[PDB]
Amino acid sequence: EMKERLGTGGFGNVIRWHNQETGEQIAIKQCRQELSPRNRERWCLEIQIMRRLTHPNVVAARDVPEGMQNLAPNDLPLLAMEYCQGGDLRKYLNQFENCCGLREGAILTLLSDIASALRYLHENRIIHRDLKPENIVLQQGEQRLIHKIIDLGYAKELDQGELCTEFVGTLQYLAPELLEQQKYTVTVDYWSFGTLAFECITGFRPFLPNWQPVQWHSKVRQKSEVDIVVSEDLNGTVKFSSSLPYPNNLNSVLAERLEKWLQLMLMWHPRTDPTYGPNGCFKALDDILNLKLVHILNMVTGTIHTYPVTEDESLQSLKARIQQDTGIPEEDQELLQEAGLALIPDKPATQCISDDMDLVFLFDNSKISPRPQPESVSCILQEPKRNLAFFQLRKVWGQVWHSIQTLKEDCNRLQQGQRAAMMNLLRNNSCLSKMKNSMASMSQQLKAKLDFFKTSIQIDLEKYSEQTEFGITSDKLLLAWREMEQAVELCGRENEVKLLVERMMALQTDIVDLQRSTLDDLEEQARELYRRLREKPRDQRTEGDSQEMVRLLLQAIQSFEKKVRVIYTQLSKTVVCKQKALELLPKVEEVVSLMNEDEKTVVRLQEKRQKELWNLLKIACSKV
Amino acid sequence: EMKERLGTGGFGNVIRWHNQETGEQIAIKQCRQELSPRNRERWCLEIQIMRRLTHPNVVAARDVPEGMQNLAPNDLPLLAMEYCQGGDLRKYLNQFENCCGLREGAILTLLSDIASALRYLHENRIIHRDLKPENIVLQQGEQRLIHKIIDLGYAKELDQGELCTEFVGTLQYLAPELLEQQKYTVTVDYWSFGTLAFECITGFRPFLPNWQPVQWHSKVRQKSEVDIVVSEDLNGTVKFSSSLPYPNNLNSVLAERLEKWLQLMLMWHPRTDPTYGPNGCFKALDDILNLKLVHILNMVTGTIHTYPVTEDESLQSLKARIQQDTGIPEEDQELLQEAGLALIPDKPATQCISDDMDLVFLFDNSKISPRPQPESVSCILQEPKRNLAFFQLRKVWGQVWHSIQTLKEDCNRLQQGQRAAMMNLLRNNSCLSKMKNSMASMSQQLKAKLDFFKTSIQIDLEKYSEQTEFGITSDKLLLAWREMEQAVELCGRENEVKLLVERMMALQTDIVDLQRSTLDDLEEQARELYRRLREKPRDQRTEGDSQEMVRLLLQAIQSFEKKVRVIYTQLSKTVVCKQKALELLPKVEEVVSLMNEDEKTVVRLQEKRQKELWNLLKIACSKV
């Protein structure tokens, strides 16, 4: 057996063991080298802790190998535990595509997981203190992944003592008040968990670069109360803000939302959700996580627009909410779902999620071709310069293709906009139109039937013509009995509707004749530079430049405004057809209706032209 | 005016003259150089002959240029004659396409022409003797071409001695018995004409190829009783075949037909077979040429199937004949003519050759795709070993692309099969179907009319309900006046023809749901090699290989069986629709017909229910 180490370091040394046969992957943590009696007595505590209270997101202690117990460099016990393959969070964070601070809801997994983990220990009288991504493995699971935690050498039992007294590795984390200061409560973890997530989101903690033991404890401790971001734009201009940075698209609402949490759950004793005042972690992050939010795309222009709904927010409520932001009355509000299908009114807003997807929305008009893309600092604060950095461009360059991949990403959003927009036109057409249209063809049948009337009454008209002698001596109600034949014959409108359908039939197919008809390249091309820089040797912290990278981001926009114009050109054209049908659906609605009136009720009540014989046959009988 | 030479050589030298103006193209034949008195006296004969007895297929002597009767220091006359532009048969036979022998009926032209030419001279007491394709021009004409003959300086008046004894020329042709042997009759031409056609067909000019005129008379006269082809397969193993080469590609029956003629009309004195006529030439070839034959394509599989008909072979006769060969009873015999149109039964045999142009035939079933396929020897006798042909590959390689061009050619035959097959479906559809179909729409009119009955009788039914009026005088013709309402109401297919169209509408789209119909490239790609070899510098046409050419012919079939399967896949599918309509037609043919009877004529003669008032208005008047 023996291989690597799950989360090596800590107090001793964890090693992956493979019990010859079976197939089980175990992990034992043998002490580095027997130290003082207090340290050994301390370790016996650590192993004692693992043995009890365990749950996911936190490795579960296993039982020492049946006989592999003997083999012990130290006559001291051995800490056995499960083996979690895959993980080493850093390996993830260090990914080249996750650079610049990720940019997906995958941060929720980390939060919801590491939360259920800390919450567990805390309520069990334990403090990990050292919560660095180096001991957070992403073991596989059912669907997504499980954020399990390894080695707990660095621990604090709220009923006796501690364990790890040194610092095996970096300490970029670990709450300040824990930095060899006086006592420390459970709040020490809240800080680690904060900066840890602060990195999973943004892509690095506040003042992360500038050493740690240096003026760090002097600067980071200085000002910036209830703040967060503390880096340095442009040159060495040391600054500190109080809001999640820019290079990261976690979510419109979520951003400015948990921003306050990662701002709160980031300190000493007072941090501890404000809503109550005691502790953050627990309830704090919980409410945010399991919150139901939807996504609306203002196809009018200003893309994106997330709205946090309830477990049953009536759709009627939402339509009004959106109108409040990006105008557009509840009337001309067309909401399609990346498939053209229109939403359901009877069903509550809660439906445009169901365990990325959103709800592409549009309005009524005939189209403008903008695409406002705010450019975060750092890079925008580099356009005037082009003076080239020395190495910082490792991230600077980074947040560029991530800015281009944002244009490619954002383009596909408005693309999914018309893709869903015109999709709707095909529905209210080949259905509640093409069908109605083709059915109105029965008109040729209705007018044709009317002609039989000139063979059942007209042919029967010649019966009173040659019946003659004693009865037509009046000719009273017989006058217009022939003047009405030259009347009903001069009124049909059957051919008329025929010229419309034959010409309209062209549009019916003209529209379906569509569903047919680089920035994508630039995004990939640019990526080549980072993959070549972050992988390049370690002797190039000089040279410095960005002239090429900038020339790419430039061509990205030069090609973005290009595709955008085309998309809105194809969209504005599909709207012309939607209006050319939505208004010309009634043009064939009235014409077909003018038949069940000008024809039906007209020639139907015309039974008098066949009833005026109902008196002639009794008025000419009451004679003699 | 001096130019080239029609058929230069012979006795003197023919030259193309262009009388300055006018535009006429004349041809004069000035003697090489005044020879002995006998030769000159001989030449004066040749020029004397041309001046008389002339007809097409044989240059006609013209009158010496009105002016310039000089440009030659000879006490001897000048032979003037017409100029036939284009021709030099060899130029044709030497075509890279006509290689491997003329694989088309274009051989008939040559035969029927050169025949009418020789037959002419022979009956006029002349023998050309030297009938090499070098003096046979293909002058243009009305439709096809005229195989005219030039220079006769080697002819022989059967009355005024020979013309000019002299070997010269490749000599190859010219009957053996004429090869400086003793006397010679008119049979000497029969041989020339034979080998001449033997070349136009096979392309090899069989009966010993390039063999030396000396080591010929020995290996030629050898056995080969009534034989023809004489070459050497693989190595140098010479053979004597009695049936022309398989790669003739001219016609199924014609091949093995005139094969015996070209076998007969190919020898010396006795052979030339009055076995049915005067001699070969005359009657022989005549009967063959003027024979009427048809072409049937057994779409079942075994393509091709020509049948020699008479001047009036009743079609009933042929159908039985074909059944005898490729089974398929006279019942399930569908014969279409590259247009889907079915043949005419009352019309005889000629019905097919409306003077390629064949008669694509099929049978009844539902498919799976096999197919017969020869390959001829030589090449097939080379697959077991395709390495180092020293030179022979000049023709071997040849009859390969001619084999691939045969696959490309054959493919387009079956392609013209479905191209004509489905062509027929479109006819018996958008016509004797789509028309019948749309007309059955009147059903909605017929059932709709029936509703008037519940306004002319149902509204008149409420008259006897509150009867306080005068709508009866004897209840005589009033009895069935209500029994007919429950009658006309129980006859109105509003659901019959409707169920057919709705279901049929599926087939209407089921057929159009098709329309999805390499080798073309291969044929051309291969050609590149011949064009590169037959043109390869006079010192590199040797070498030895074929490994590449074979790899091509292989990919040809590998791609042939590919397209074939697809074609039969598209065909077998169209047959499914034809049967899905042919059987689902009459069922909608009668139902729609039961309307123009149960509805039209029924409710139309129902004018009596509107005419019984024609007497009530005169029977109640003859009382006053």
From Swiss-Prot, chains A, B:
The modification Hydroxyproline is found at P176. It is found in: Cytoplasm; Nucleus; Membrane raft. Its main location: cytoplasm. Changing K29A: Loss of kinase activity and no effect on binding to NIK. Does not phosphorylate STAT1 at 'Thr-749'. Highly expressed in heart, placenta, skeletal muscle, kidney, pancreas, spleen, thymus, prostate, testis and peripheral blood. InterPro entries: IKBKB_SDD (IPR041185), IKBKB_SDD_sf (IPR046375), IKK (IPR051180), IKKbetaNEMObind (IPR022007), Kinase-like_dom_sf (IPR011009), Prot_kinase_dom (IPR000719), Ser/Thr_kinase_AS (IPR008271), Ubiquitin-like_dom (IPR000626). GO terms for cellular component: CD40 receptor complex; cytoplasm; cytoplasmic side of plasma membrane; cytosol; IkappaB kinase complex; membrane raft; nucleus. Keywords: Acetylation, ATP-binding, Cytoplasm, Disease variant, Host-virus interaction, Hydroxylation, Isopeptide bond, Kinase, Membrane, Nucleotide-binding, Nucleus, Phosphoprotein, S-nitrosylation, SCID, Serine/threonine-protein kinase, Transferase, Ubl conjugation. It holds the Pfam family Pkinase. GO terms for biological process: antigen processing and presentation of exogenous peptide antigen via MHC class I, TAP-dependent; canonical NF-kappaB signal transduction; cellular response to tumor necrosis factor; Fc-epsilon receptor signaling pathway; inflammatory response; innate immune response; interleukin-1-mediated signaling pathway; MyD88-dependent toll-like receptor signaling pathway. PROSITE patterns: PROTEIN_KINASE_DOM, PROTEIN_KINASE_ST. Residues 1-282 form the Protein kinase domain. Residues 425-446 are annotated as: Leucine-zipper. GO terms for molecular function: ATP binding; identical protein binding; IkappaB kinase activity; protein heterodimerization activity; protein homodimerization activity; protein kinase activity; protein kinase binding; protein serine kinase activity. The modification (Microbial infection) O-acetylthreonine is found at T165. Phosphorylated by MAP3K7/TAK1 in response to NOD1 and NOD2 signaling, promoting activation and phosphorylation of NF-kappa-B inhibitors, leading to NF-kappa-B activation. Once activated, autophosphorylates on the C-terminal serine cluster; which decreases activity and prevents prolonged activation of the inflammatory response. (Microbial infection) Acetylation of Thr-165 by Yersinia YopJ prevents phosphorylation and activation, thus blocking the I-kappa-B pathway. Gene3D superfamilies: 1.20.1270.250, 6.10.250.2110, Phosphatidylinositol 3-kinase Catalytic Subunit, Chain A, domain 1, Transferase(Phosphotransferase) domain 1. Belongs to the protein kinase superfamily. Ser/Thr protein kinase family. I-kappa-B kinase subfamily. The kinase domain is located in the N-terminal region. The leucine zipper is important to allow homo- and hetero-dimerization. At the C-terminal region is located the region responsible for the interaction with NEMO/IKBKG. Component of the I-kappa-B-kinase (IKK) core complex consisting of CHUK, IKBKB and IKBKG; probably four alpha/CHUK-beta/IKBKB dimers are associated with four gamma/IKBKG subunits. The IKK core complex seems to associate with regulatory or adapter proteins to form a IKK-signalosome holo-complex. The IKK complex associates with TERF2IP/RAP1, leading to promote IKK-mediated phosphorylation of RELA/p65. Part of a complex composed of NCOA2, NCOA3, CHUK/IKKA, IKBKB, IKBKG and CREBBP. Part of a 70-90 kDa complex at least consisting of CHUK/IKKA, IKBKB, NFKBIA, RELA, ELP1 and MAP3K14. This is Inhibitor of nuclear factor kappa-B kinase subunit beta. It comes from Homo sapiens (Human).
